[PDB]
């Protein structure tokens, strides 16, 4: 109940800077219509939008974390169709995703929406820590299935590895909350609710690789 | 215990509605730049400032609740004012919202922001699951006041209703459409905290007709 409330407080705090900045751009546009170059007027509108996206990210992230607390209806579903949907949606010209999915359907018992979120957070984390390369793959063993994401980032040592699931940041870099940390903490909790486990390591290209195991019926 | 959750969900969830509207205004500027004149461009910007206030309002309400312990400070306000506010915000040049409000004002004991949130949720759904037609109406009765929103969508089959008021529960029909399964859950809680009642039904055109009744005290 309460680790959540504290977290909600952080979210509202982190929202202040983006929000103030939007009102600000909004206000100059409002007053400077006669005045402004179309180039600049566009750069305010563009920056507004970048900021709105920042907000939606944190809010969504929190809601997802919230949902993690409650029990969800499980069903049989194809892991590769879920991954496919998320990869399309996180798929951008900004970032190119390498798809290397197991070439057969994988049935696992899951709440699809929850899985979609776990995948999505892994992707954005891999887009932050990484240098642009992201690879999503899946596969299966007799007893358990898996999906994983990989970046060409710095590659996190087993020491820092533990303090990677922390939503709150020690430094107070003017931000109460780590999006990266909260994200992975969300993933951690979703995998657990599915009776799976996470497994971290180095990728093909030296970066981070996080893999999520799930039970097959 | 379960309740504290839906409070928190309600805050973050309801923050998105105004932000989203912003993305709509920002983009139209970003694209329409050559074309647009003062009068409208000035309006778009004003709309962004309104909606950013709304975000702070929502944030403020939560912080107050943290110090006060009291979440929805009640008071006598004009229901219609709040309705008109939401009708204005949510209708653009693209989208037009029909109106059958009660003439004059309706004084009700409410927490105006919270109701504004409720009405918003109802109206974004009417857009989300409807086919463009949306009608907001209000009226009053001997001891009660009401507002409803109506869409021309498929409505909600009575068998489904109780199921869909639960938090984080979406519709299979909804699966197609994006979302969170929270709007109705929130609307209910807000209306409950006002000791009101929700009444679902079929709209003028076969869609959902969702109506909130509020008590009007008597000296
Ligand atoms: N106006 C409507 N017409 C038809 N169906 C509706 C309407 N409003 C809600 N529904 C259905 O009721 C379900 C519950 O909606 P709700 O709990 O409001 O969250 P949501 O609209 O799914 N997502 P969100 O608003 O983003 O949290 C939806 O998934 C729809 O199937
Ligand atoms: Mg809704």
Short mmCIF file of C-alpha atoms and ligand atoms in Angstrom, two decimals:
data_model
loop_
_atom_site.label_atom_id
_atom_site.label_comp_id
_atom_site.label_asym_id
_atom_site.label_seq_id
_atom_site.Cartn_x
_atom_site.Cartn_y
_atom_site.Cartn_z
CA UNK A 1 0.00 0.00 0.00
CA UNK A 2 2.66 2.49 1.10
CA UNK A 3 5.75 1.84 -1.07
CA UNK A 4 3.19 2.61 -3.77
CA UNK A 5 2.03 5.92 -2.27
CA UNK A 6 5.61 7.10 -1.90
CA UNK A 7 6.16 6.10 -5.51
CA UNK A 8 3.04 8.01 -6.63
CA UNK A 9 4.51 11.04 -4.83
CA UNK A 10 7.72 10.67 -6.82
CA UNK A 11 5.78 10.43 -10.06
CA UNK A 12 3.88 13.64 -9.41
CA UNK A 13 7.21 15.29 -8.48
CA UNK A 14 8.96 14.14 -11.68
CA UNK A 15 6.01 15.41 -13.68
CA UNK A 16 6.49 19.04 -12.57
CA UNK A 17 9.42 19.95 -14.88
CA UNK A 18 7.91 18.59 -18.13
CA UNK A 19 4.57 20.12 -17.19
CA UNK A 20 5.91 23.59 -16.37
CA UNK A 21 7.84 23.57 -19.62
CA UNK A 22 4.76 22.78 -21.69
CA UNK A 23 2.70 25.58 -20.14
CA UNK A 24 5.68 27.84 -20.88
CA UNK A 25 5.96 26.99 -24.58
CA UNK A 26 2.21 27.06 -24.75
CA UNK A 27 2.17 30.53 -23.27
CA UNK A 28 4.75 32.09 -25.61
CA UNK A 29 2.91 30.69 -28.61
CA UNK A 30 -0.25 32.21 -27.16
CA UNK A 31 1.27 35.69 -26.87
CA UNK A 32 3.69 35.73 -29.80
CA UNK A 33 1.51 34.68 -32.69
CA UNK A 34 2.21 37.85 -34.67
CA UNK A 35 5.88 37.69 -33.66
CA UNK A 36 7.27 34.24 -34.42
CA UNK A 37 9.10 32.40 -37.18
CA UNK A 38 7.38 29.22 -38.38
CA UNK A 39 10.65 27.35 -37.76
CA UNK A 40 10.58 28.23 -34.08
CA UNK A 41 6.83 27.92 -33.60
CA UNK A 42 7.34 24.38 -34.87
CA UNK A 43 10.26 23.67 -32.61
CA UNK A 44 7.99 24.78 -29.65
CA UNK A 45 5.17 22.41 -30.82
CA UNK A 46 7.69 19.60 -31.37
CA UNK A 47 9.20 20.02 -27.93
CA UNK A 48 5.72 20.09 -26.32
CA UNK A 49 5.14 16.72 -27.88
CA UNK A 50 8.47 15.30 -26.75
CA UNK A 51 7.50 16.32 -23.21
CA UNK A 52 3.97 14.94 -23.34
CA UNK A 53 5.59 11.62 -24.31
CA UNK A 54 7.88 11.83 -21.31
CA UNK A 55 4.86 12.24 -19.06
CA UNK A 56 2.79 9.43 -20.57
CA UNK A 57 5.83 7.17 -20.11
CA UNK A 58 6.07 7.67 -16.35
CA UNK A 59 2.36 7.55 -15.74
CA UNK A 60 1.93 4.41 -17.78
CA UNK A 61 4.95 2.93 -16.07
CA UNK A 62 3.32 3.55 -12.67
CA UNK A 63 -0.08 2.15 -13.67
CA UNK A 64 1.68 -0.96 -14.92
CA UNK A 65 3.46 -1.29 -11.58
CA UNK A 66 0.14 -0.85 -9.84
CA UNK A 67 -1.50 -3.64 -11.86
CA UNK A 68 1.41 -5.86 -10.94
CA UNK A 69 -0.09 -6.08 -7.45
CA UNK A 70 -3.40 -7.62 -8.52
CA UNK A 71 -4.17 -11.11 -9.82
CA UNK A 72 -5.01 -11.29 -13.53
CA UNK A 73 -6.91 -13.84 -15.63
CA UNK A 74 -4.42 -16.27 -17.20
CA UNK A 75 -5.02 -18.01 -20.52
CA UNK A 76 -3.22 -20.00 -23.19
CA UNK A 77 -1.54 -17.74 -25.71
CA UNK A 78 1.25 -17.77 -28.30
CA UNK A 79 4.32 -16.06 -26.90
CA UNK A 80 5.54 -15.16 -30.41
CA UNK A 81 2.35 -13.33 -31.33
CA UNK A 82 2.65 -11.24 -28.17
CA UNK A 83 6.28 -10.41 -28.82
CA UNK A 84 5.35 -9.60 -32.41
CA UNK A 85 2.79 -7.03 -31.36
CA UNK A 86 5.06 -5.24 -28.89
CA UNK A 87 8.00 -5.24 -31.32
CA UNK A 88 5.82 -3.54 -33.94
CA UNK A 89 4.70 -0.93 -31.43
CA UNK A 90 8.17 -0.22 -30.02
CA UNK A 91 9.40 -0.53 -33.54
CA UNK A 92 10.54 2.92 -34.68
CA UNK A 93 12.65 4.74 -37.25
CA UNK A 94 14.34 6.14 -34.14
CA UNK A 95 15.33 2.54 -33.18
CA UNK A 96 15.70 -0.64 -35.24
CA UNK A 97 14.86 -3.95 -33.65
CA UNK A 98 16.35 -7.26 -34.76
CA UNK A 99 13.72 -10.03 -34.69
CA UNK A 100 14.97 -13.59 -34.35
CA UNK A 101 11.95 -15.49 -33.08
CA UNK A 102 11.70 -19.22 -32.55
CA UNK A 103 10.09 -20.53 -35.75
CA UNK A 104 7.14 -22.25 -34.13
CA UNK A 105 4.29 -21.23 -31.88
CA UNK A 106 4.99 -21.35 -28.14
CA UNK A 107 1.96 -21.79 -25.85
CA UNK A 108 2.42 -20.49 -22.33
CA UNK A 109 -0.06 -19.62 -19.61
CA UNK A 110 -0.05 -15.81 -19.23
CA UNK A 111 -1.90 -12.55 -18.89
CA UNK A 112 -1.07 -11.15 -22.36
CA UNK A 113 -1.27 -7.47 -21.50
CA UNK A 114 1.12 -7.96 -18.58
CA UNK A 115 3.65 -9.77 -20.78
CA UNK A 116 3.40 -7.07 -23.44
CA UNK A 117 4.41 -4.54 -20.80
CA UNK A 118 7.33 -6.57 -19.51
CA UNK A 119 8.59 -6.87 -23.06
CA UNK A 120 8.10 -3.16 -23.73
CA UNK A 121 10.05 -2.07 -20.65
CA UNK A 122 12.91 -4.38 -21.58
CA UNK A 123 12.99 -2.77 -25.02
CA UNK A 124 13.10 0.84 -23.81
CA UNK A 125 15.72 -0.07 -21.21
CA UNK A 126 17.70 -1.64 -24.02
CA UNK A 127 17.21 1.53 -26.08
CA UNK A 128 18.59 3.69 -23.25
CA UNK A 129 21.53 1.57 -22.11
CA UNK A 130 22.32 0.57 -25.71
CA UNK A 131 23.97 2.22 -28.74
CA UNK A 132 21.04 1.55 -31.12
CA UNK A 133 21.09 -2.20 -31.73
CA UNK A 134 18.32 -4.16 -30.08
CA UNK A 135 17.62 -7.88 -30.59
CA UNK A 136 14.50 -9.68 -29.46
CA UNK A 137 14.40 -13.46 -29.58
CA UNK A 138 12.38 -16.37 -28.18
CA UNK A 139 12.68 -20.10 -27.79
CA UNK A 140 11.69 -23.11 -25.78
CA UNK A 141 12.84 -26.21 -23.96
CA UNK A 142 10.82 -29.25 -22.98
CA UNK A 143 9.82 -27.67 -19.63
CA UNK A 144 10.14 -23.92 -19.99
CA UNK A 145 9.98 -21.20 -22.65
CA UNK A 146 11.83 -17.90 -22.88
CA UNK A 147 12.11 -14.55 -24.55
CA UNK A 148 15.04 -12.14 -24.33
CA UNK A 149 16.23 -8.70 -25.37
CA UNK A 150 19.80 -7.67 -26.03
CA UNK A 151 21.52 -4.33 -26.51
CA UNK A 152 24.99 -3.27 -27.73
CA UNK A 153 25.40 -1.12 -24.60
CA UNK A 154 28.08 -1.02 -21.91
CA UNK A 155 27.20 -4.38 -20.39
CA UNK A 156 26.30 -4.19 -16.72
CA UNK A 157 28.65 -5.97 -14.29
CA UNK A 158 27.13 -8.46 -11.78
CA UNK A 159 27.71 -5.81 -9.05
CA UNK A 160 25.62 -3.00 -10.56
CA UNK A 161 23.27 -5.76 -11.73
CA UNK A 162 21.58 -5.93 -8.31
CA UNK A 163 20.89 -2.18 -7.98
CA UNK A 164 19.25 -2.16 -11.41
CA UNK A 165 15.76 -2.96 -10.10
CA UNK A 166 15.62 0.15 -7.89
CA UNK A 167 12.86 2.66 -8.82
CA UNK A 168 14.25 5.39 -6.49
CA UNK A 169 17.61 7.10 -7.17
CA UNK A 170 20.18 7.90 -4.44
CA UNK A 171 21.91 10.86 -6.15
CA UNK A 172 18.86 13.15 -6.29
CA UNK A 173 19.65 14.21 -9.83
CA UNK A 174 16.51 16.39 -9.50
CA UNK A 175 14.44 13.27 -10.24
CA UNK A 176 12.85 11.15 -7.54
CA UNK A 177 12.41 8.20 -9.92
CA UNK A 178 14.48 6.04 -12.23
CA UNK A 179 12.41 5.01 -15.28
CA UNK A 180 14.99 2.36 -16.09
CA UNK A 181 14.86 0.95 -12.56
CA UNK A 182 11.09 1.08 -12.15
CA UNK A 183 10.75 -0.58 -15.56
CA UNK A 184 12.94 -3.55 -14.66
CA UNK A 185 11.22 -3.77 -11.28
CA UNK A 186 7.92 -3.98 -13.17
CA UNK A 187 9.37 -6.75 -15.36
CA UNK A 188 10.72 -8.56 -12.30
CA UNK A 189 7.25 -8.53 -10.70
CA UNK A 190 5.39 -9.59 -13.86
CA UNK A 191 7.72 -12.52 -14.48
CA UNK A 192 7.23 -13.57 -10.84
CA UNK A 193 3.45 -13.39 -11.09
CA UNK A 194 3.86 -15.82 -14.01
CA UNK A 195 6.06 -18.14 -11.91
CA UNK A 196 9.02 -17.41 -14.16
CA UNK A 197 12.46 -16.01 -13.48
CA UNK A 198 14.70 -13.37 -15.01
CA UNK A 199 18.25 -14.07 -16.05
CA UNK A 200 20.74 -11.34 -16.86
CA UNK A 201 24.03 -11.50 -18.74
CA UNK A 202 26.20 -10.16 -21.54
CA UNK A 203 24.91 -10.07 -25.11
CA UNK A 204 26.47 -11.07 -28.45
CA UNK A 205 27.73 -7.51 -28.88
CA UNK A 206 28.99 -7.05 -25.29
CA UNK A 207 25.89 -5.24 -23.99
CA UNK A 208 23.17 -6.28 -21.56
CA UNK A 209 20.96 -9.29 -22.23
CA UNK A 210 17.95 -9.98 -20.09
CA UNK A 211 16.02 -13.22 -20.53
CA UNK A 212 12.67 -14.13 -19.03
CA UNK A 213 11.86 -17.79 -18.43
CA UNK A 214 8.28 -19.05 -18.23
CA UNK A 215 6.76 -22.43 -17.45
CA UNK A 216 5.24 -24.53 -20.21
CA UNK A 217 2.18 -26.55 -19.13
CA UNK B 1 -7.16 -1.76 1.54
CA UNK B 2 -8.14 -2.70 -2.01
CA UNK B 3 -9.63 0.83 -2.22
CA UNK B 4 -6.39 2.82 -1.81
CA UNK B 5 -5.25 1.21 -5.07
CA UNK B 6 -8.13 2.39 -7.20
CA UNK B 7 -7.59 5.90 -5.74
CA UNK B 8 -4.01 5.94 -6.97
CA UNK B 9 -4.96 4.31 -10.24
CA UNK B 10 -7.60 6.97 -10.63
CA UNK B 11 -5.13 9.83 -10.30
CA UNK B 12 -2.51 8.62 -12.80
CA UNK B 13 -5.19 7.29 -15.12
CA UNK B 14 -7.07 10.59 -15.18
CA UNK B 15 -3.90 12.57 -15.77
CA UNK B 16 -3.67 11.07 -19.27
CA UNK B 17 -6.97 12.43 -20.57
CA UNK B 18 -5.74 16.06 -20.65
CA UNK B 19 -2.21 15.21 -21.80
CA UNK B 20 -3.65 13.23 -24.71
CA UNK B 21 -5.81 16.16 -25.75
CA UNK B 22 -2.59 18.17 -25.80
CA UNK B 23 -0.87 15.82 -28.24
CA UNK B 24 -3.87 16.52 -30.48
CA UNK B 25 -3.41 20.31 -30.28
CA UNK B 26 0.41 20.29 -30.48
CA UNK B 27 0.36 18.14 -33.62
CA UNK B 28 -2.24 20.19 -35.47
CA UNK B 29 0.01 23.23 -34.91
CA UNK B 30 3.07 21.26 -35.96
CA UNK B 31 1.38 20.40 -39.27
CA UNK B 32 -1.00 23.26 -40.00
CA UNK B 33 1.55 26.01 -39.46
CA UNK B 34 1.35 27.81 -42.80
CA UNK B 35 -2.43 27.62 -42.89
CA UNK B 36 -3.51 28.70 -39.39
CA UNK B 37 -4.56 32.22 -38.41
CA UNK B 38 -4.22 34.15 -35.14
CA UNK B 39 -7.75 33.56 -33.86
CA UNK B 40 -7.51 29.76 -33.88
CA UNK B 41 -3.82 29.30 -33.13
CA UNK B 42 -4.34 31.50 -30.06
CA UNK B 43 -7.22 29.22 -29.12
CA UNK B 44 -5.23 26.00 -29.53
CA UNK B 45 -2.62 27.44 -27.19
CA UNK B 46 -5.24 28.51 -24.65
CA UNK B 47 -6.66 24.98 -24.70
CA UNK B 48 -3.21 23.59 -23.92
CA UNK B 49 -2.92 25.95 -20.93
CA UNK B 50 -6.32 24.92 -19.63
CA UNK B 51 -5.44 21.24 -19.90
CA UNK B 52 -2.09 21.75 -18.18
CA UNK B 53 -3.97 23.43 -15.28
CA UNK B 54 -6.20 20.41 -15.07
CA UNK B 55 -3.13 18.22 -14.69
CA UNK B 56 -1.90 20.31 -11.80
CA UNK B 57 -5.35 20.32 -10.25
CA UNK B 58 -5.31 16.54 -10.29
CA UNK B 59 -1.80 16.42 -8.86
CA UNK B 60 -2.74 19.00 -6.22
CA UNK B 61 -5.80 17.02 -5.13
CA UNK B 62 -3.61 14.00 -4.44
CA UNK B 63 -1.04 15.96 -2.43
CA UNK B 64 -3.82 17.51 -0.35
CA UNK B 65 -5.14 14.03 0.29
CA UNK B 66 -1.69 13.12 1.58
CA UNK B 67 -1.62 15.89 4.18
CA UNK B 68 -5.37 16.11 4.89
CA UNK B 69 -6.39 12.45 4.64
CA UNK B 70 -9.50 13.89 3.01
CA UNK B 71 -9.73 13.18 -0.70
CA UNK B 72 -12.91 14.86 -2.04
CA UNK B 73 -13.73 18.08 -0.10
CA UNK B 74 -17.43 18.66 -0.83
CA UNK B 75 -19.18 21.96 -1.61
CA UNK B 76 -22.07 23.51 -3.49
CA UNK B 77 -21.31 24.04 -7.16
CA UNK B 78 -22.94 24.29 -10.55
CA UNK B 79 -22.95 20.86 -12.16
CA UNK B 80 -23.58 22.42 -15.59
CA UNK B 81 -20.46 24.56 -15.29
CA UNK B 82 -18.39 21.41 -14.89
CA UNK B 83 -20.24 19.71 -17.72
CA UNK B 84 -19.70 22.64 -20.10
CA UNK B 85 -16.04 22.65 -19.16
CA UNK B 86 -15.66 19.01 -20.24
CA UNK B 87 -17.87 19.42 -23.29
CA UNK B 88 -15.69 22.33 -24.42
CA UNK B 89 -12.38 20.56 -23.79
CA UNK B 90 -13.44 17.34 -25.48
CA UNK B 91 -15.10 18.77 -28.57
CA UNK B 92 -12.73 20.01 -31.27
CA UNK B 93 -13.23 21.16 -34.84
CA UNK B 94 -13.12 17.47 -35.75
CA UNK B 95 -15.50 16.26 -33.04
CA UNK B 96 -18.81 17.92 -32.13
CA UNK B 97 -20.65 16.99 -28.92
CA UNK B 98 -24.43 17.35 -28.75
CA UNK B 99 -25.91 19.03 -25.75
CA UNK B 100 -29.17 18.92 -23.85
CA UNK B 101 -28.24 20.58 -20.60
CA UNK B 102 -30.79 21.82 -18.09
CA UNK B 103 -31.35 25.59 -18.40
CA UNK B 104 -29.67 27.72 -15.77
CA UNK B 105 -27.64 26.07 -13.08
CA UNK B 106 -27.85 23.00 -10.90
CA UNK B 107 -26.47 23.44 -7.42
CA UNK B 108 -25.22 20.16 -6.09
CA UNK B 109 -23.05 19.11 -3.22
CA UNK B 110 -19.94 17.79 -4.97
CA UNK B 111 -16.17 17.75 -5.26
CA UNK B 112 -16.13 19.50 -8.67
CA UNK B 113 -12.79 18.22 -9.99
CA UNK B 114 -13.63 14.61 -9.22
CA UNK B 115 -16.90 14.90 -11.07
CA UNK B 116 -15.13 16.60 -13.94
CA UNK B 117 -12.89 13.52 -14.08
CA UNK B 118 -15.88 11.17 -14.06
CA UNK B 119 -17.56 13.04 -16.90
CA UNK B 120 -14.33 13.05 -18.90
CA UNK B 121 -13.99 9.27 -18.70
CA UNK B 122 -17.55 8.80 -19.88
CA UNK B 123 -16.98 11.15 -22.82
CA UNK B 124 -13.63 9.71 -23.98
CA UNK B 125 -15.26 6.27 -23.99
CA UNK B 126 -18.16 7.59 -26.03
CA UNK B 127 -15.62 8.68 -28.58
CA UNK B 128 -13.57 5.51 -28.17
CA UNK B 129 -16.42 2.99 -28.59
CA UNK B 130 -18.90 5.11 -30.52
CA UNK B 131 -19.16 6.21 -34.13
CA UNK B 132 -18.79 9.95 -33.71
CA UNK B 133 -22.12 10.93 -32.13
CA UNK B 134 -21.93 11.95 -28.49
CA UNK B 135 -24.62 13.62 -26.42
CA UNK B 136 -24.31 15.14 -22.99
CA UNK B 137 -27.47 15.99 -21.07
CA UNK B 138 -28.40 17.01 -17.54
CA UNK B 139 -31.58 17.58 -15.59
CA UNK B 140 -33.05 17.54 -12.11
CA UNK B 141 -35.89 16.06 -10.07
CA UNK B 142 -37.61 16.63 -6.71
CA UNK B 143 -34.57 15.45 -4.71
CA UNK B 144 -32.02 14.37 -7.32
CA UNK B 145 -29.86 15.78 -10.10
CA UNK B 146 -28.39 13.92 -13.04
CA UNK B 147 -26.08 14.02 -16.00
CA UNK B 148 -25.71 11.47 -18.79
CA UNK B 149 -23.52 10.86 -21.80
CA UNK B 150 -24.72 8.85 -24.80
CA UNK B 151 -22.89 7.38 -27.83
CA UNK B 152 -24.05 5.69 -31.04
CA UNK B 153 -21.77 2.67 -30.53
CA UNK B 154 -22.81 -0.90 -29.73
CA UNK B 155 -23.79 -0.22 -26.11
CA UNK B 156 -22.97 -2.69 -23.33
CA UNK B 157 -25.05 -5.85 -22.99
CA UNK B 158 -26.56 -6.00 -19.47
CA UNK B 159 -24.89 -9.37 -18.76
CA UNK B 160 -21.48 -7.67 -19.16
CA UNK B 161 -22.05 -4.62 -17.03
CA UNK B 162 -21.22 -5.74 -13.48
CA UNK B 163 -18.16 -7.53 -14.84
CA UNK B 164 -16.80 -4.44 -16.59
CA UNK B 165 -16.93 -2.09 -13.57
CA UNK B 166 -14.05 -4.06 -12.07
CA UNK B 167 -10.64 -2.44 -12.23
CA UNK B 168 -8.18 -3.60 -14.89
CA UNK B 169 -10.93 -5.41 -16.72
CA UNK B 170 -11.29 -4.66 -20.39
CA UNK B 171 -13.85 -5.85 -22.96
CA UNK B 172 -13.26 -8.57 -25.55
CA UNK B 173 -15.14 -6.18 -27.84
CA UNK B 174 -12.76 -3.61 -26.38
CA UNK B 175 -9.65 -5.77 -27.07
CA UNK B 176 -9.64 -4.25 -30.61
CA UNK B 177 -9.54 -0.76 -29.06
CA UNK B 178 -6.62 0.31 -26.79
CA UNK B 179 -7.04 0.95 -23.02
CA UNK B 180 -6.67 -0.05 -19.36
CA UNK B 181 -10.01 -1.20 -17.98
CA UNK B 182 -10.19 1.61 -15.46
CA UNK B 183 -12.48 4.44 -16.65
CA UNK B 184 -15.72 2.89 -15.46
CA UNK B 185 -14.14 1.55 -12.29
CA UNK B 186 -13.08 5.12 -11.46
CA UNK B 187 -16.38 6.67 -12.46
CA UNK B 188 -18.15 4.30 -10.10
CA UNK B 189 -15.93 5.08 -7.15
CA UNK B 190 -16.28 8.81 -7.73
CA UNK B 191 -20.05 8.54 -7.94
CA UNK B 192 -20.15 6.25 -4.86
CA UNK B 193 -18.13 8.71 -2.79
CA UNK B 194 -20.94 11.22 -3.61
CA UNK B 195 -23.54 8.71 -2.47
CA UNK B 196 -24.84 8.75 -6.04
CA UNK B 197 -26.02 6.05 -8.38
CA UNK B 198 -24.97 5.02 -11.88
CA UNK B 199 -27.56 3.81 -14.34
CA UNK B 200 -26.53 2.19 -17.67
CA UNK B 201 -28.89 1.83 -20.62
CA UNK B 202 -29.24 2.10 -24.38
CA UNK B 203 -28.78 5.50 -25.95
CA UNK B 204 -31.09 7.36 -28.34
CA UNK B 205 -29.31 5.46 -31.15
CA UNK B 206 -28.60 2.04 -29.66
CA UNK B 207 -25.29 2.87 -27.99
CA UNK B 208 -24.43 3.06 -24.30
CA UNK B 209 -26.34 5.57 -22.22
CA UNK B 210 -24.64 6.12 -18.90
CA UNK B 211 -26.24 8.35 -16.32
CA UNK B 212 -25.11 9.49 -12.92
CA UNK B 213 -27.64 10.51 -10.29
CA UNK B 214 -26.64 12.79 -7.45
CA UNK B 215 -28.51 13.54 -4.24
CA UNK B 216 -29.64 17.15 -3.69
CA UNK B 217 -29.88 17.81 0.03
CA UNK B 218 -32.79 19.77 1.49
CA UNK B 219 -32.19 22.34 4.28
N1 LIG C 1 -19.53 3.87 -24.47
C1 LIG C 1 -19.31 2.55 -24.59
N2 LIG C 1 -19.87 1.81 -25.59
C2 LIG C 1 -19.58 0.50 -25.66
N3 LIG C 1 -18.75 -0.13 -24.79
C3 LIG C 1 -18.14 0.51 -23.78
C4 LIG C 1 -18.40 1.94 -23.63
N4 LIG C 1 -17.69 2.35 -22.57
C5 LIG C 1 -17.02 1.27 -22.06
N5 LIG C 1 -17.30 0.18 -22.80
C6 LIG C 1 -16.80 -1.19 -22.53
O1 LIG C 1 -16.52 -1.35 -21.13
C7 LIG C 1 -15.16 -1.73 -20.93
C8 LIG C 1 -14.60 -1.06 -19.69
O2 LIG C 1 -14.16 0.27 -19.95
P1 LIG C 1 -13.21 1.04 -18.89
O3 LIG C 1 -13.07 0.31 -17.57
O4 LIG C 1 -13.77 2.41 -19.02
O5 LIG C 1 -11.69 1.07 -19.41
P2 LIG C 1 -11.26 1.14 -20.95
O6 LIG C 1 -12.16 2.12 -21.68
O7 LIG C 1 -11.19 -0.26 -21.45
N6 LIG C 1 -9.72 1.66 -20.79
P3 LIG C 1 -9.24 3.05 -20.06
O8 LIG C 1 -10.36 4.05 -20.20
O9 LIG C 1 -8.04 3.49 -20.88
O10 LIG C 1 -8.84 2.65 -18.65
C9 LIG C 1 -14.44 -1.33 -22.21
O11 LIG C 1 -13.26 -2.12 -22.42
C10 LIG C 1 -15.52 -1.52 -23.26
O12 LIG C 1 -15.62 -2.87 -23.69
MG1 LIG C 2 -12.75 4.16 -20.67
#
